[PDB]
Coordinates of C-alpha atoms and ligand atoms in Angstrom, one line a residue:
Chain A
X30 CA 1.9 25.9 -19.7
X31 CA 1.5 22.7 -17.8
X32 CA -1.1 20.0 -18.6
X33 CA -2.5 17.9 -15.8
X34 CA -3.7 14.5 -16.9
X35 CA -5.5 12.2 -14.4
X36 CA -6.4 8.6 -14.7
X37 CA -7.6 6.2 -12.0
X38 CA -6.0 2.9 -12.9
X39 CA -2.5 1.7 -14.0
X40 CA -4.1 0.4 -17.3
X41 CA -5.6 3.8 -18.0
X42 CA -2.4 5.8 -17.7
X43 CA 0.1 3.4 -19.2
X44 CA 0.0 4.6 -22.8
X45 CA 0.5 8.3 -21.8
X46 CA 3.0 7.5 -19.1
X47 CA 5.3 5.8 -21.8
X48 CA 5.3 9.0 -23.8
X49 CA 6.6 11.3 -21.1
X50 CA 10.2 12.5 -21.7
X51 CA 12.7 13.2 -18.9
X52 CA 10.2 11.6 -16.6
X53 CA 10.3 12.3 -12.9
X54 CA 8.2 10.0 -10.7
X55 CA 6.9 10.9 -7.2
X56 CA 4.9 8.6 -5.0
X57 CA 2.8 10.2 -2.3
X58 CA -0.3 9.1 -0.3
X59 CA -1.1 6.3 -2.7
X60 CA -0.8 8.5 -5.7
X61 CA 1.8 8.4 -8.4
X62 CA 2.8 11.6 -10.3
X63 CA 4.8 11.5 -13.5
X64 CA 6.2 14.9 -14.6
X65 CA 8.1 15.7 -17.8
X66 CA 7.1 16.6 -21.4
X67 CA 4.9 14.9 -24.1
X68 CA 5.8 16.0 -27.6
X69 CA 7.4 19.2 -26.2
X70 CA 4.7 20.3 -23.7
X71 CA 5.0 20.1 -19.9
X72 CA 2.7 17.5 -18.4
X73 CA 2.0 16.0 -15.0
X74 CA 0.3 12.6 -15.2
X75 CA -1.5 11.4 -12.0
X76 CA -2.5 7.9 -11.3
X77 CA -5.0 8.6 -8.6
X78 CA -6.6 5.3 -7.7
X79 CA -10.3 4.4 -8.0
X80 CA -13.3 6.3 -6.6
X81 CA -14.4 9.7 -5.5
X82 CA -12.1 10.0 -2.4
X83 CA -8.9 8.9 -4.0
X84 CA -9.6 11.1 -7.1
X85 CA -10.3 14.1 -4.9
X86 CA -7.3 13.6 -2.7
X87 CA -5.1 13.1 -5.7
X88 CA -6.4 16.1 -7.6
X89 CA -5.9 18.3 -4.6
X90 CA -2.3 17.2 -4.3
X91 CA -1.8 17.6 -8.1
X92 CA -3.1 21.2 -8.1
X93 CA -1.6 22.4 -4.9
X94 CA 1.9 20.9 -5.6
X95 CA 2.2 21.1 -9.4
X96 CA 0.0 23.9 -10.5
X97 CA -1.2 22.6 -13.8
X98 CA -3.0 25.1 -16.0
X99 CA -5.6 22.7 -17.1
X100 CA -6.8 19.2 -16.1
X101 CA -7.8 16.4 -18.5
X102 CA -9.4 13.2 -17.0
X103 CA -8.6 10.1 -19.1
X104 CA -9.8 6.6 -18.9
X105 CA -12.8 4.2 -19.3
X106 CA -16.5 4.7 -18.7
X107 CA -19.8 2.8 -18.8
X108 CA -22.0 3.9 -21.7
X109 CA -25.6 5.1 -21.3
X110 CA -26.1 7.0 -24.6
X111 CA -27.6 4.7 -27.2
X112 CA -25.3 5.8 -30.0
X113 CA -22.1 4.8 -28.1
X114 CA -20.3 1.6 -28.8
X115 CA -17.5 0.0 -26.9
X116 CA -14.3 1.9 -27.7
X117 CA -16.0 5.2 -28.6
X118 CA -14.9 8.4 -26.9
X119 CA -17.2 10.3 -24.4
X120 CA -16.5 14.0 -23.6
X121 CA -18.0 15.8 -20.6
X122 CA -20.2 18.9 -21.3
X123 CA -20.6 18.8 -17.5
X124 CA -20.3 16.4 -14.7
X125 CA -22.7 15.5 -11.8
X126 CA -22.6 13.2 -8.7
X127 CA -25.3 10.6 -9.5
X128 CA -25.1 9.4 -5.9
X129 CA -25.4 12.8 -4.0
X130 CA -28.8 13.4 -2.3
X131 CA -29.1 16.5 -0.1
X132 CA -32.7 17.2 -1.5
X133 CA -33.8 17.4 2.2
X134 CA -32.4 20.9 2.3
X135 CA -33.6 22.0 -1.1
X136 CA -30.7 21.1 -3.3
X137 CA -31.5 19.4 -6.6
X138 CA -30.7 15.7 -6.9
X139 CA -27.0 15.1 -7.4
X140 CA -26.1 18.6 -6.1
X141 CA -23.8 18.6 -3.1
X142 CA -24.5 21.2 -0.4
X143 CA -22.1 24.1 -1.0
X144 CA -21.6 23.2 -4.7
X145 CA -23.1 24.1 -8.0
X146 CA -25.6 21.4 -9.3
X147 CA -23.1 20.5 -12.1
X148 CA -19.5 21.1 -12.9
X149 CA -19.2 22.6 -16.4
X150 CA -16.2 21.6 -18.6
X151 CA -14.0 24.6 -19.5
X152 CA -15.1 26.2 -22.8
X153 CA -11.6 26.8 -24.2
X154 CA -10.6 23.2 -23.3
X155 CA -13.8 22.0 -25.0
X156 CA -12.8 23.8 -28.2
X157 CA -9.5 21.9 -28.1
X158 CA -11.3 18.6 -27.6
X159 CA -13.4 19.4 -30.6
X160 CA -10.3 20.2 -32.7
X161 CA -8.7 16.9 -31.5
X162 CA -11.9 15.0 -32.5
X163 CA -11.8 16.7 -36.0
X164 CA -8.2 15.3 -36.4
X165 CA -9.5 11.7 -35.7
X166 CA -12.1 11.6 -38.5
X167 CA -13.0 7.9 -38.4
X168 CA -13.7 7.8 -34.7
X169 CA -17.1 8.3 -33.1
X170 CA -17.6 10.3 -29.9
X171 CA -20.5 11.6 -27.9
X172 CA -20.5 14.8 -25.7
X173 CA -22.8 15.1 -22.8
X174 CA -23.4 14.7 -19.1
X175 CA -21.1 12.3 -17.3
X176 CA -22.3 11.1 -14.0
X177 CA -20.1 9.8 -11.2
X178 CA -20.7 7.7 -8.1
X179 CA -18.9 5.4 -5.8
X180 CA -20.3 2.3 -7.6
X181 CA -19.7 0.2 -10.6
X182 CA -23.0 0.4 -12.4
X183 CA -24.0 -3.1 -13.6
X184 CA -27.7 -3.6 -12.8
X185 CA -31.0 -2.5 -14.5
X186 CA -32.2 -1.0 -11.2
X187 CA -29.2 1.3 -10.8
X188 CA -29.4 2.2 -14.5
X189 CA -33.0 3.1 -14.0
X190 CA -32.2 5.3 -11.0
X191 CA -29.5 7.2 -12.8
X192 CA -31.6 7.7 -16.0
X193 CA -34.7 8.7 -14.0
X194 CA -32.8 11.4 -12.1
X195 CA -30.3 12.4 -14.8
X196 CA -32.2 11.8 -18.1
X197 CA -29.5 13.4 -20.3
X198 CA -26.7 11.1 -18.9
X199 CA -24.3 9.7 -21.6
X200 CA -21.9 7.7 -19.4
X201 CA -21.0 6.9 -15.9
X202 CA -17.8 6.3 -14.0
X203 CA -16.3 6.7 -10.5
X204 CA -13.9 9.7 -10.5
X205 CA -15.0 12.5 -12.8
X206 CA -17.2 14.5 -10.4
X207 CA -14.5 14.3 -7.7
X208 CA -11.9 15.6 -10.1
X209 CA -14.4 18.2 -11.4
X210 CA -15.5 19.4 -8.0
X211 CA -11.9 19.6 -6.8
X212 CA -10.9 21.6 -9.9
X213 CA -13.9 23.8 -9.3
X214 CA -12.8 24.5 -5.7
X215 CA -9.3 25.4 -7.0
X216 CA -10.7 27.3 -10.0
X217 CA -8.8 25.2 -12.5
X218 CA -10.3 24.4 -15.9
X219 CA -11.1 20.7 -16.6
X220 CA -12.5 18.4 -19.2
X221 CA -13.2 14.6 -19.2
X222 CA -12.2 12.7 -22.2
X223 CA -12.9 9.0 -21.6
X224 CA -13.9 6.0 -23.7
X225 CA -16.5 3.2 -23.4
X226 CA -15.5 -0.2 -21.9
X227 CA -19.0 -1.6 -21.3
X228 CA -22.7 -0.5 -21.2
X229 CA -23.2 -0.6 -17.4
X230 CA -25.4 -3.8 -17.4
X231 CA -25.2 -7.3 -16.0
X232 CA -22.4 -8.2 -18.5
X233 CA -20.3 -5.1 -17.6
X234 CA -18.0 -6.8 -15.1
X235 CA -16.8 -9.1 -17.9
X236 CA -17.0 -6.5 -20.7
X237 CA -15.0 -4.0 -18.6
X238 CA -12.0 -6.3 -18.0
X239 CA -12.0 -7.4 -21.7
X240 CA -12.3 -3.9 -23.2
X241 CA -10.5 -1.7 -20.7
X242 CA -7.3 -1.8 -22.9
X243 CA -9.4 -0.7 -25.9
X244 CA -11.0 2.2 -23.9
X245 CA -7.6 3.3 -22.6
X246 CA -6.3 3.3 -26.2
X247 CA -9.2 5.4 -27.5
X248 CA -9.2 7.8 -24.7
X249 CA -5.4 8.2 -24.7
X250 CA -5.3 8.9 -28.5
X251 CA -7.7 11.8 -28.0
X252 CA -5.9 13.1 -25.0
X253 CA -2.6 13.0 -26.9
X254 CA -4.1 14.9 -29.8
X255 CA -5.2 17.5 -27.3
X256 CA -1.7 17.7 -25.8
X257 CA -0.3 18.3 -29.3
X258 CA -2.9 21.1 -30.0
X259 CA -2.3 22.7 -26.6
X260 CA 1.5 22.9 -27.5
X261 CA 0.7 25.7 -30.0
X262 CA -2.5 27.1 -28.5
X263 CA -1.5 30.6 -27.8
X264 CA -4.4 31.4 -25.4
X265 CA -3.1 28.7 -23.0
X266 CA 0.6 29.1 -23.8
Chain B
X257 CA 2.7 17.5 18.8
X258 CA 0.3 19.0 16.3
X259 CA -3.4 18.1 16.5
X260 CA -5.5 18.3 13.3
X261 CA -9.2 18.9 13.8
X262 CA -11.7 18.7 11.0
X263 CA -15.4 19.8 10.8
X264 CA -17.6 20.4 7.8
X265 CA -19.8 23.3 8.8
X266 CA -19.4 26.7 10.3
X267 CA -21.4 25.8 13.4
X268 CA -19.3 22.6 13.8
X269 CA -16.0 24.4 13.9
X270 CA -17.1 27.6 15.7
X271 CA -16.6 26.6 19.3
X272 CA -13.1 25.3 18.8
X273 CA -12.2 28.1 16.4
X274 CA -12.9 30.6 19.3
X275 CA -10.5 28.8 21.6
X276 CA -7.5 29.1 19.2
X277 CA -4.7 31.4 20.5
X278 CA -2.7 33.5 18.0
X279 CA -5.0 32.3 15.3
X280 CA -3.8 32.3 11.7
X281 CA -6.5 31.9 9.0
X282 CA -5.7 30.6 5.6
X283 CA -8.4 30.3 2.8
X284 CA -7.5 27.8 0.1
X285 CA -9.6 25.8 -2.4
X286 CA -12.9 26.6 -0.7
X287 CA -11.6 25.4 2.7
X288 CA -10.5 27.4 5.7
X289 CA -7.6 26.4 8.0
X290 CA -7.2 28.0 11.4
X291 CA -3.8 27.5 13.0
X292 CA -2.6 28.3 16.5
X293 CA -2.7 26.8 19.9
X294 CA -5.4 25.5 22.3
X295 CA -4.0 25.5 25.8
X296 CA -0.4 25.3 24.7
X297 CA -0.8 22.6 22.0
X298 CA -0.4 23.4 18.3
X299 CA -3.7 22.8 16.4
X300 CA -4.8 23.2 12.9
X301 CA -8.6 23.4 12.5
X302 CA -10.0 22.6 9.0
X303 CA -13.5 23.7 8.0
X304 CA -13.8 21.3 5.1
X305 CA -17.2 21.9 3.7
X306 CA -19.8 19.2 3.3
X307 CA -19.5 15.8 1.7
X308 CA -16.9 13.3 0.6
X309 CA -15.1 15.2 -2.1
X310 CA -14.7 18.4 0.0
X311 CA -13.6 16.4 3.0
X312 CA -11.1 14.4 1.0
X313 CA -9.5 17.4 -0.8
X314 CA -9.4 19.4 2.5
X315 CA -7.9 16.5 4.4
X316 CA -5.2 16.0 1.7
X317 CA -4.3 19.7 1.9
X318 CA -4.3 19.6 5.7
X319 CA -1.9 16.6 5.9
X320 CA 0.4 17.6 3.0
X321 CA 0.8 21.2 4.1
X322 CA 0.5 21.1 7.9
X323 CA 1.6 17.6 8.9
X324 CA -0.7 17.1 11.9
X325 CA 0.3 14.1 14.0
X326 CA -3.3 13.0 14.5
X327 CA -6.7 13.9 13.0
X328 CA -9.9 14.3 15.0
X329 CA -13.2 14.6 13.0
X330 CA -15.8 16.6 15.0
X331 CA -19.4 17.7 14.2
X332 CA -22.9 16.3 14.0
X333 CA -24.3 12.9 12.9
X334 CA -27.5 11.0 12.3
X335 CA -28.0 8.4 15.0
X336 CA -28.7 4.7 14.3
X337 CA -28.0 3.1 17.7
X338 CA -31.3 2.9 19.6
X339 CA -29.8 4.4 22.8
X340 CA -28.8 7.7 21.2
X341 CA -30.6 11.0 21.9
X342 CA -29.9 14.3 20.3
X343 CA -26.7 15.7 21.8
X344 CA -25.2 12.2 22.7
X345 CA -21.7 11.5 21.4
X346 CA -20.5 8.9 18.9
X347 CA -16.9 7.7 18.8
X348 CA -15.7 5.7 15.7
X349 CA -14.3 2.2 16.2
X350 CA -14.0 2.2 12.4
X351 CA -15.5 3.9 9.4
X352 CA -17.0 2.6 6.1
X353 CA -18.5 4.1 3.0
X354 CA -22.2 3.0 3.2
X355 CA -22.6 4.1 -0.4
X356 CA -19.7 2.3 -2.1
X357 CA -20.5 -0.8 -4.2
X358 CA -17.9 -2.6 -6.3
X359 CA -19.1 -6.0 -5.2
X360 CA -19.0 -7.0 -8.9
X361 CA -15.2 -7.3 -8.5
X362 CA -15.1 -9.4 -5.3
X363 CA -15.0 -6.5 -2.8
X364 CA -17.5 -6.5 0.1
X365 CA -20.3 -4.0 0.3
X366 CA -19.0 -0.5 1.2
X367 CA -15.4 -1.4 0.3
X368 CA -13.9 0.8 -2.3
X369 CA -11.7 -0.9 -4.9
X370 CA -8.0 -0.7 -3.9
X371 CA -9.0 0.1 -0.3
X372 CA -9.5 -2.0 2.9
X373 CA -13.1 -2.7 3.7
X374 CA -13.0 -0.5 6.8
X375 CA -10.8 2.3 8.1
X376 CA -10.0 1.5 11.8
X377 CA -9.7 4.4 14.2
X378 CA -6.4 4.7 16.0
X379 CA -6.2 2.7 19.3
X380 CA -4.5 5.5 21.3
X381 CA -7.0 8.1 20.0
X382 CA -9.9 5.8 20.9
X383 CA -8.4 5.5 24.4
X384 CA -8.1 9.3 24.7
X385 CA -11.7 9.6 23.6
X386 CA -12.7 7.1 26.4
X387 CA -10.6 9.0 28.9
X388 CA -12.3 12.3 27.9
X389 CA -15.7 10.6 28.2
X390 CA -14.9 9.5 31.7
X391 CA -14.3 13.2 32.6
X392 CA -17.6 14.1 31.1
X393 CA -19.9 11.8 33.0
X394 CA -23.2 13.5 32.0
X395 CA -22.4 12.8 28.3
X396 CA -23.8 9.6 27.0
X397 CA -21.7 8.1 24.2
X398 CA -21.6 5.0 22.0
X399 CA -18.5 3.7 20.4
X400 CA -18.9 1.8 17.1
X401 CA -19.1 1.8 13.3
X402 CA -19.7 5.2 11.6
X403 CA -20.9 5.0 8.0
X404 CA -20.5 7.8 5.5
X405 CA -22.2 8.6 2.2
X406 CA -22.9 11.6 0.0
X407 CA -26.5 11.7 1.2
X408 CA -28.4 13.3 4.1
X409 CA -30.2 10.2 5.3
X410 CA -33.8 11.0 6.1
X411 CA -36.0 8.2 4.7
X412 CA -37.0 4.8 6.1
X413 CA -35.9 3.2 2.8
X414 CA -32.4 4.6 3.0
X415 CA -32.1 4.0 6.8
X416 CA -33.1 0.4 6.2
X417 CA -30.6 -0.1 3.3
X418 CA -27.8 1.0 5.5
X419 CA -28.9 -1.1 8.4
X420 CA -29.3 -4.2 6.2
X421 CA -25.8 -3.9 4.8
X422 CA -24.0 -2.5 7.9
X423 CA -26.0 -3.9 10.9
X424 CA -23.7 -2.6 13.6
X425 CA -23.8 1.0 12.3
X426 CA -24.1 3.5 15.2
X427 CA -24.4 6.7 13.2
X428 CA -24.1 8.1 9.7
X429 CA -22.7 11.3 8.2
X430 CA -21.2 12.7 5.0
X431 CA -17.4 13.2 5.6
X432 CA -15.8 10.7 7.9
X433 CA -15.0 7.9 5.4
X434 CA -13.3 10.5 3.2
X435 CA -11.3 11.8 6.1
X436 CA -10.5 8.2 7.2
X437 CA -9.6 6.9 3.7
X438 CA -7.4 10.0 3.2
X439 CA -5.7 9.5 6.6
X440 CA -5.2 5.8 5.6
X441 CA -3.5 6.8 2.4
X442 CA -1.2 9.2 4.3
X443 CA -0.7 6.8 7.2
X444 CA -2.0 9.4 9.8
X445 CA -4.0 8.2 12.9
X446 CA -7.6 9.4 13.1
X447 CA -10.7 9.2 15.2
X448 CA -14.2 10.5 14.7
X449 CA -15.9 12.1 17.7
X450 CA -19.3 13.5 16.7
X451 CA -22.7 14.1 18.4
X452 CA -26.2 13.4 17.4
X453 CA -28.4 16.0 15.7
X454 CA -31.3 13.7 14.4
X455 CA -32.1 10.0 13.9
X456 CA -31.9 9.8 10.2
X457 CA -35.6 9.7 9.4
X458 CA -38.4 11.9 8.0
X459 CA -38.1 14.4 10.9
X460 CA -34.3 14.8 10.4
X461 CA -34.4 18.0 8.4
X462 CA -36.2 19.8 11.2
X463 CA -34.3 18.0 14.0
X464 CA -31.0 18.8 12.4
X465 CA -31.9 22.5 12.2
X466 CA -32.9 22.5 15.8
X467 CA -30.1 20.4 17.3
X468 CA -27.0 21.2 15.2
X469 CA -26.0 23.7 17.9
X470 CA -26.4 21.1 20.7
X471 CA -24.4 18.5 18.7
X472 CA -21.6 21.0 18.0
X473 CA -21.5 21.8 21.7
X474 CA -21.4 18.2 22.9
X475 CA -18.8 17.1 20.3
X476 CA -16.6 20.2 20.8
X477 CA -16.5 19.7 24.6
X478 CA -15.3 16.1 24.0
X479 CA -12.7 17.3 21.5
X480 CA -11.4 20.0 23.9
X481 CA -11.0 17.4 26.6
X482 CA -9.1 15.2 24.2
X483 CA -6.8 18.1 23.3
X484 CA -6.0 18.6 27.0
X485 CA -5.3 14.9 27.5
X486 CA -3.0 14.7 24.4
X487 CA -1.0 17.7 25.6
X488 CA -0.4 16.0 28.9
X489 CA 0.2 12.3 28.0
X490 CA 2.9 12.3 25.3
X491 CA 1.0 9.5 23.5
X492 CA 2.1 11.0 20.2
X493 CA 5.4 12.8 19.4
Ligands
TDI31 C1 -12.5 -1.6 -11.0 S1 -13.7 -0.4 -10.6 C2 -14.1 0.3 -12.1 C3 -13.1 1.4 -12.6 C4 -13.3 1.8 -14.1 N1 -13.8 3.2 -14.1 C5 -14.7 3.5 -15.2 C6 -15.9 2.6 -15.4 C7 -16.1 1.8 -16.6 N2 -17.3 1.2 -16.5 C8 -18.0 1.6 -15.5 C9 -19.3 1.3 -14.9 N3 -20.1 0.4 -15.6 N4 -19.7 1.9 -13.8 C10 -18.8 2.7 -13.1 N5 -17.6 3.1 -13.5 C11 -17.2 2.5 -14.7 C12 -14.4 3.4 -12.7 C13 -13.3 2.7 -11.9 O1 -12.1 3.5 -11.9
TDI32 C1 -26.5 20.0 5.5 S1 -26.0 18.4 5.0 C2 -25.7 17.7 6.6 C3 -24.4 18.0 7.2 C4 -24.3 17.5 8.7 N1 -23.4 16.3 8.7 C5 -23.8 15.3 9.7 C6 -25.2 14.7 9.6 C7 -26.1 14.9 10.6 N2 -27.3 14.2 10.3 C8 -27.1 13.5 9.2 C9 -27.9 12.6 8.4 N3 -29.2 12.3 8.8 N4 -27.4 12.1 7.3 C10 -26.2 12.4 6.9 N5 -25.3 13.2 7.6 C11 -25.8 13.7 8.7 C12 -23.3 15.8 7.3 C13 -23.3 17.2 6.5 O1 -22.0 17.8 6.8

């Protein structure tokens, strides 16, 4: 099997990039693809750039050219769930666009026309995420709805909008729904395994730059454990 | 040369689809690609689906697999310029995301992180659009800023947010900034040539239903004229 791993920023992919053996680097359309193995499993790591369009474009190139069997989205996120602290892992049960509104034509809020209302994380991949979490016993995670938009959420008004329309939201970020929607269109299983850098408030621009390395470390530790598990997961292999 | 043409919806691509000689249809990732010739020029017509993520993934697949020399985005739009009636044409001078906000990190409103603030349409393609307009004297057109978001704009509050932040906007829609950003990352010239189906207000849902066919007709006639000009002029090799 081949594991696709996607992160937006250089800082988000650095830890995993350094673990790739026999690394082959390709640059295309503002994306960087690193292929090789991590601990004996084939991987392709994509640094996509920030936001929904870059993430969608990169994911489409990833799937069409490299044919990963699964896709794992790594990186940082803004926490909405009360139980999350900076550094904690967040796992997608499902992903929605918090900034999509085609309700004029009867779609529910966040649902894009021609799409399901939500993109559900793959059940088998989810089981692997759970096993990985069980192998990191002193770490706290929350699983739930992750909401994506083309905005860095850092105001009370935007928090209120997102909570009012997506009351179960546990975290927000800027790529996951694009990755998830793209995987959905290609019929490729995905899961998001990110970690909290800030709590999406007026302090978040400062918190984010301060704690991005911590979030990358936490998210990357989980993704690495998942890679290790997938190595000997006979359903996927 | 090879001309790439992109529209979101079935009605938006139907007129041009019917003109393709020796048509070859490929279905991939929830997109449809029609390849062949229109009046002796190679074309690839992408039916992208609706919204930024579908448009981005489709455009990435289009450019990476078919290598069009230029990209023309056709279809409908919500008019903002006061002079626009349903059926009138809009030509992009440039495109912006009206729903992007990373101003917390120094970017201007609508600018995505890691991107320029606007995506400028290609000068030669704009010239060809103007030449086409001159040969269609009973089409009224406005050239200017087109703004994109993952929303069907149909409320005074949303219309006014967009006008406040992008005062020169002439029309809005849901794919162009994704196409434009993707073309920017691949370094492929683009232009948007759309036509008005509604004026982005409370009556837009009904206006859109009524006037989508007219908008497809008007925009497609312009695009066909542009195809004929591009065949003749050798502007692009
Ligand atoms: C430099 S732009 C921010 C980058 C970090 N990614 C995740 C993220 C952390 N905190 C967030 C918040 N409060 N709102 C939205 N997104 C995020 C999103 C983007 O790649
Ligand atoms: C069924 S969703 C609408 C489809 C038609 N496209 C253009 C468009 C016309 N009027 C618009 C408006 N008021 N707001 C945003 N977009 C548009 C966008 C999408 O493909």
